[PDB]
C-alpha cells in the first residue's frame, strides 16, 4: 500500500548468556516510553507495546519484544511520485485521437512507454516488489506498460491501413460493409459521404483508432 502503508517493526531483547533458569526478564511497563521523543516528520508513531514471551516446548527461552507500529506520512511521495505517474498514465490514451496524417503517433506512444518504464524502475528501487506483496502502484505501472505496448502495435497497424491506395491495395467487400457502414454507426460517427478509394482507407483507419480510443478510456477509467 505504499505510500499509504503501515509498518510493524519489532525489537526482540534477550540475554545471549543466560536462560530462563538463570535470569527472568520482566517488563517495567506494557508500552515503550515516549517521554523524550523527537517526532520524525516522515513516520507517525501509532503504538509501541511490549510483551514477555516464553516457549512451552523449550523452557530455557525468555524474551521481551516491542512492536513498533508506525504509519507513513504520505504527502511527500504522493506529490512526488503518484501525481507524475498519473500524469504520464493519462497520456496513454491520446495516441488513438492523434490523426494519422500528423506523422507523430510513434513518438507519443514510444515516449509514454519510456516514461512508464523509468517510473517502474524507480519505484522498484524505492519499494522493492517481492513474492509476498507487490506495490499496487508498481502493478498499475506494469499494467499500463502492457497497454501502451499493445497501443504501439495497434498504432502500427492503423498507420499501415491509413497509407493504402487502390494502386497498391484492394478493399475487400466485407471491409466496406463493416468499417464504412456498421461499426461507425455503433461509434456514432456517420461518415459524411457527400460524394476516392484512398479516402475510404483513411476512414477505415480513423474508425479503427476510434474503436480503441473507447476501450482505452474505458479500461483506463476502470483503472481507477
Amino acid at each position: 500500500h505504499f505510500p499509504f502503508d503501515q509498518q510493524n517493526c519489532t525489537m526482540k531483547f534477550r540475554s545471549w548468556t543466560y536462560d530462563r533458569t538463570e535470569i527472568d526478564l520482566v517488563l517495567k511497563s506494557e508500552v515503550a516510553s515516549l517521554d523524550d521523543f523527537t517526532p520524525s516528520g516522515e513516520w507517525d508513531i501509532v503504538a509501541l507495546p511490549g510483551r514477555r514471551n516464553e516457549n512451552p516446548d523449550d523452557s530455557t527461552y525468555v524474551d521481551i519484544t516491542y512492536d513498533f507500529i508506525i504509519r507513513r506520512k504520505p504527502l511527500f511521495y504522493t506529490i512526488n511520485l503518484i501525481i507524475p505517474c498519473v500524469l504520464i498514465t493519462s497520456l496513454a490514451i491520446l495516441v488513438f485521437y492523434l490523426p494519422s496524417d500528423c506523422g507523430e503517433k510513434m513518438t507519443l506512444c514510444i515516449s509514454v512507454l519510456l516514461a512508464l518504464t523509468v517510473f517502474l524502475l524507480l519505484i522498484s528501487k524505492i519499494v522493492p516488489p517481492t513474492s509476498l506483496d507487490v506495490p499496487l502502484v508498481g502493478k498499475y505501472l506494469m499494467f499500463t506498460m502492457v497497454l501502451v505496448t499493445f497501443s504501439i502495435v495497434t498504432s502500427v497497424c492503423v498507420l499501415n491501413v491509413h497509407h493504402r491506395s487502390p494502386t497498391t491495395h484492394t478493399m475487400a467487400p466485407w471491409v466496406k460493409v463493416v468499417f464504412l457502414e456498421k461499426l461507425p454507426a455503433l461509434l456514432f460517427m456517420q461518415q459524411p459521404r457527400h460524394h476516392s478509394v484512398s479516402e475510404d482507407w483513411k476512414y477505415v483507419a480513423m474508425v479503427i483508432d476510434r474503436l480503441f480510443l473507447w476501450i482505452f478510456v474505458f479500461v483506463c477509467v476502470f483503472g481507477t
Epitope: 506494557e30 521523543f37 503504538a47 509501541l48
Partner: antibody, heavy 118, light 113 residues
C-alpha cells in the same frame, strides 16, 4: 490508572472553552487520549485523539476546525479547546485512554459537562 | 470516515431472554494481523461507558461470560445469554480498524413487561 477531568463549565455563545484530562498511574505519553462528545439527547460521537508523546492528532470530519488538541508532557495533562461555541456544543465530554490494535478504551474520565447559554 | 450502523434502535427484551444487537460497517474493517478491531461498549445512565468486548470476539477482563461477539468483514453481532437489571443501558459498537475511528449509533436496551 485514573483519568481526572476538569470541572463543569458554563460559557456564552461564541466563546471558547478549554477542558483538560489528567492521566496518572501509567505512561501518559505512550497512550492515545480519545475525546468523546455525548449530547444530552443521545449518542456517543468521537471528536478525535492525540498522542501526548508526539504531537500527532486526528479529528473526525464533523469536528475538523471546531476542536483543537494540545498536550503537556511535564504535567500529565491533555487539553481540548472548543472554538465558537454554539448551542449544539452543550454536552458532556469524555476523555479515554486508547492504544490502537492492542488495548481498547478501558479507562474513561469522569466526564466534563459544558453548557452554552446566554 | 467508516460509517457504522446499529440495529435495532431499541431492543425491548424481558429478564432472562436472549438479546441480539447487530452492527454493520460501510466498508470491510478487517486487518492484516489476522484480527479485525471491533469493540462493544456499555453505558449506564449518568455514567461513563465501559468496555465489554474487543477484537470482535475477545472478552474483556471482569465482564460476565454471558456476553459474546461474532461477525465477519462487515457484519458483527453481540449476544447476551441472560438479561439482568445491571444489563440495562446503551450498547455501542466501536471500530478500531480505519482512521478515524467511529462509534456506532447506539442500541438502547429495555425490559418488556
Amino acid at each position: 490508572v485514573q483519568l481526572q477531568q476538569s470541572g463543569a463549565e458554563v460559557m456564552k455563545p461564541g466563546a471558547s472553552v478549554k477542558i483538560s484530562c489528567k492521566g496518572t498511574g501509567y505512561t501518559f505519553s505512550s497512550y492515545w487520549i480519545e475525546w468523546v462528545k455525548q449530547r444530552p439527547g443521545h449518542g456517543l460521537e468521537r471528536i478525535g485523539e492525540i498522542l501526548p508523546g508526539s504531537g500527532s492528532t486526528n479529528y473526525n470530519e464533523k469536528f475538523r476546525g471546531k476542536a483543537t488538541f494540545t498536550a503537556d508532557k511535564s504535567s500529565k495533562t491533555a487539553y481540548m479547546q472548543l472554538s465558537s461555541l454554539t448551542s449544539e456544543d452543550s454536552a458532556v465530554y469524555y476523555c479515554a485512554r486508547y492504544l490502537p490494535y492492542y488495548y481498547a478504551m478501558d479507562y474513561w474520565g469522569q466526564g466534563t459537562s459544558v453548557t452554552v447559554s446566554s | 470516515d467508516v460509517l457504522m450502523t446499529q440495529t435495532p434502535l431499541s431492543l425491548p427484551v424481558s429478564l432472562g431472554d436472549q438479546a441480539s444487537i447487530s452492527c454493520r460497517s460501510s466498508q470491510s474493517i478487517v486487518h492484516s494481523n489476522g484480527n479485525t478491531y471491533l469493540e462493544w461498549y456499555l453505558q449506564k445512565p449518568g455514567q461513563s461507558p465501559k468496555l465489554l468486548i474487543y477484537k470482535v470476539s475477545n472478552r474483556f477482563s471482569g465482564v460476565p461470560d454471558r456476553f459474546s461477539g461474532s461477525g465477519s468483514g462487515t457484519d458483527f453481532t453481540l449476544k447476551i445469554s441472560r438479561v439482568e437489571a445491571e444489563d440495562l443501558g446503551v450498547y455501542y459498537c466501536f471500530q478500531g480498524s480505519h482512521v478515524p475511528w467511529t462509534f456506532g449509533g447506539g442500541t438502547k436496551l429495555e425490559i418488556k413487561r
